[PDB]
């Protein structure tokens, strides 16, 4: 009859509630009318092609604007002293001083300074001209199309796959490991040795000459013969100019380690070697499980056989195979969990080990990328912990999982939750305690009475890596051991050079200030996990509500009876954790940024002393770096940072607006609207017009969402405005 068509019960709502909820439930296929397992699987599979189409289109546009409105070529010729251009600006509201200030990077008009690091990435892989960027944009536009073509193709009956096909896991793993991971990594190693590395050295190897240009002097033979060391005889000289055939070796596969001294980035030869190396593990690994040829494993049976006799895990993992394969919420929560972990692994390894040329010197880009991925990694983790409860409520079969490791979690759930409470309470009581204590004496003017615990455990790890600072005498920095000498030159000499670099971010110096914050982050992790698992383990029910299983993942509440039951659903527990997640990542990004902007200014001394007490954070970090930001537009002038000053205030406004939906609740607003409904009816010249949807206050759950969205958007945008401007201003 009406929108939403997928929900008839929703479509018959006379109020404005239907339009809202029609949007918020469009992707929840399992709740749609007359849903079948068949319809469920190839809706996702088709929605999957839709997502790919967006990514390729989004990436196509990036290659387009940089080629059309970005200099790039000007950037290539002097990567150190030119600012990359994202795209042009066209805004009628712009005053002349605006068009003025934003004209940068040698552009004919006002543009935006790119902080995505696409310039360094594209330059490192071998893109040298705008023409190259266009061909990529066209190719991605074409890739974006065939994704839609495949999406449309499998929605057709003559090409649609069976659910069982989707549930054949043994073969999907075998291909994804061997093909999706292995081959793609192998193919990339080819681009590196054919284009990236030779493009780095100085030769332009492209489609019209790649067929006639050897990647290596010696033939393809040495690989096939067996002697592969010949691919490492002649590496690039330390004093090598990128994009210049100066001090350029011939080797296409090395393990030098450390950084290319001019670019401060990892060697391309190391990477061409890396991907080639990992491709194999993936390639062999993608041949573990059984398919149609008579050899291979059975995942189920391996899970079945893993039962420790004599307790204490019970039935082990029996029936666990079918619980996962029949539940795509388990799979997603399992996927987000793994993806979320390596998302941070990207953030941690990309600032410590820069992969692209001239990215380490672009301090605004480095800060942005780390902060970017940590918040991305943050939200992903809350999703892995969100599809968890949904699995328990919608897809969990208690009987089929009788006394296995999964079912043993629900029967001692009070143990996991209470100790998470203890660990959270422990960390909080002392981390906050040590902080406040330190502020007291500095107020009292006696900073020599502070509790400054030296992170001696972590410093012991640093010395174990090769850092000759401190007197620890541990592996890779000791007097006699099998570890360092296993270096056998190769990685160690180039890498040990890199670790004792006082300039790079590769293993910075840490102290008492680094101790307190790491505990704050540990507090943030534990508490967030406490909230999320408690929502998961009590998703099917508690003692306050034993039949929570019968109400679904998201419901408003259970009423004011039995003392009150506000925010008792597993959905709300997620919604509460999102707050704690933002706080945690907030502390992480604060800690990363401040320690770096003090390092970049050549003044780590200020961080080492001000980070030990909380007033230092608010003043020497928050207050101190805001001056240039908040003067983006002044009652006297107008700078290029005016965008960020405005967005800074914008973020504050969205943030505070969420507070309205989180503090004030529905019954007040509904009664207010009822008076407004009366008004409109009794007002002449306005009676002629009537609404087609009954005006009602937002729902209890909707408001918690809407408020959280405001809270999260303002949270991000405010810090984004500050992270960029404060860093861009000083550089």
């Amino acid at each position: 009859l009406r929108i939403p068509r997928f929900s008839q019960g929703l479509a018959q709502d006379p109020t404005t509630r239907r339009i809202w909820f029609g949007i918020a439930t469009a992707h929840d296929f399992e709740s749609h009318d007359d849903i079948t397992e068949g319809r469920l699987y190839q809706n996702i599979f088709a929605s999957h092609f839709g997502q790919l189409a967006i990514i390729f289109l989004w990436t196509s546009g990036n290659l387009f604007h940089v080629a059309w409105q970005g200099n790039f070529e000007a950037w290539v010729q002097d990567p150190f002293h030119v600012r990359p251009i994202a795209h042009a600006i066209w805004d009628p509201h712009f005053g002349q001083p605006a068009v003025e200030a934003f004209t940068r990077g040698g552009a004919l008009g006002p543009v935006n300074n790119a902080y995505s690091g696409v310039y360094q990435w594209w330059y490192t892989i071998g893109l040298r001209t705008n023409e190259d960027l266009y061909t990529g944009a066209i190719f991605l536009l074409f890739l974006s199309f065939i994704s839609l073509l495949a999406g449309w193709l499998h929605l057709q009956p003559k090409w649609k796959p069976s659910v069982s096909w989707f549930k054949n896991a043994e073969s999907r793993l075998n291909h994804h490991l061997s093909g999706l991971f292995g081959v793609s990594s192998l193919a990339w190693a080819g681009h590196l040795v054919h284009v990236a590395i030779p493009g780095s050295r100085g030769e332009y190897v492209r489609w019209n000459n790649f067929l006639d240009v050897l990647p290596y002097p010696q033939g393809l033979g040495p690989l096939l013969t067996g002697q592969w060391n010949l691919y490492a005889q002649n590496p690039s000289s330390s004093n090598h100019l990128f994009g210049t055939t100066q001090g350029a070796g011939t080797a296409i596969l090395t393990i030098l380690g450390g950084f290319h001294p001019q670019t401060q980035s990892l060697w391309l030869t190391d990477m061409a070697h890396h991907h080639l190396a990992i491709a194999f593990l993936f390639l062999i690994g993608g041949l573990m499980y059984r398919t149609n040829f008579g050899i291979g494993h059975s995942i189920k049976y391996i899970l079945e056989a893993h039962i420790p006799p004599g307790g204490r895990l019970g039935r082990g993992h029996k029936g666990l195979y079918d619980t996962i394969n029949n539940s795509i919420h388990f799979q997603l929560g399992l996927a987000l969990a793994s993806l979320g972990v390596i998302t941070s692994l990207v953030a941690q390894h990309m600032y410590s080990l820069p992969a692209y040329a001239f990215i380490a010197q672009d301090f605004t880009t480095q800060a942005a990328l780390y902060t970017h991925h940590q918040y991305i990694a943050g939200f992903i983790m809350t999703g892995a912990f969100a599809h968890g409860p949904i699995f328990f409520i919608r897809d969990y079969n208690p009987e089929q999982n009788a006394d296995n490791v999964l079912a043993r979690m629900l029967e001692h759930k009070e143990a996991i939750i209470s100790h998470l409470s203890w660990a959270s309470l422990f960390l909080g009581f002392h981390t906050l305690g040590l902080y406040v204590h330190n502020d007291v004496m500095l107020a009292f003017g006696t900073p020599e009475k502070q509790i400054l615990i030296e992170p001696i455990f972590a410093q012991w790890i640093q010395s174990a890596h090769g850092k000759t600072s401190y007197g620890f005498d541990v592996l890779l920095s000791s007097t006699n051991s099998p570890a360092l000498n296993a270096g056998r030159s190769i990685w160690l000499p180039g890498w040990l050079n890199a670790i004792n670099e006082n300039s790079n971010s590769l293993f910075l110096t840490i102290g008492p200030g680094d101790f307190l914050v790491h505990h704050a982050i540990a507090l943030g992790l534990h508490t967030t996990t406490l909230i999320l698992v408690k929502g998961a383990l009590d998703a099917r029910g508690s003692k306050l509500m034993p039949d929570k299983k019968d109400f679904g993942y998201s419901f408003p509440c259970d009423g004011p009876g039995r003392g009150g039951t506000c925010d008792i659903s597993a959905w709300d527990d997620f919604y509460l954790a999102v707050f704690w997640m933002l706080n945690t990542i907030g502390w992480v990004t604060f800690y990363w940024h401040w320690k770096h902007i003090t390092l970049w200014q050549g003044n780590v001394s200020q961080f080492n002393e001000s980070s030990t007490y909380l007033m230092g954070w608010l003043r020497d970090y928050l207050w101190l770096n805001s001056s240039q930001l908040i003067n983006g537009y002044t009652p006297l002038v107008c700078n290029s940072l005016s965008v960020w000053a405005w967005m800074f205030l914008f973020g504050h406004l969205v943030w505070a607006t969420g507070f309205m939906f989180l503090i004030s609740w529905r019954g007040y607003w509904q009664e207010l609207i009822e008076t407004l409904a009366w008004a409109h009816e009794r007002t002449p010249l306005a009676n002629l017009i009537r609404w087609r949807d009954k005006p009602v206050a937002l729902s209890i759950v909707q408001a918690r969402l809407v408020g959280l969205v405001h809270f999260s958007v303002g949270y991000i945008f405010t810090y984004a405005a500050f992270l960029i401007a404060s860093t861009s201003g000083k550089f």
Binding site: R2, I3, A88, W90, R692, D693
Partner: peptide
């Protein structure tokens, strides 16, 4: 050139919001 397109990027909301309105009240 680029002064023709951001407005059709604003004609489009006018068109989209109108069409969607008709779709949701039907």
């Amino acid at each position: 050139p680029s002064l023709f397109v951001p407005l059709v990027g604003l004609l489009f909301p006018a068109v989209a919001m109108a069409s969607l309105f008709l779709h949701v009240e039907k």
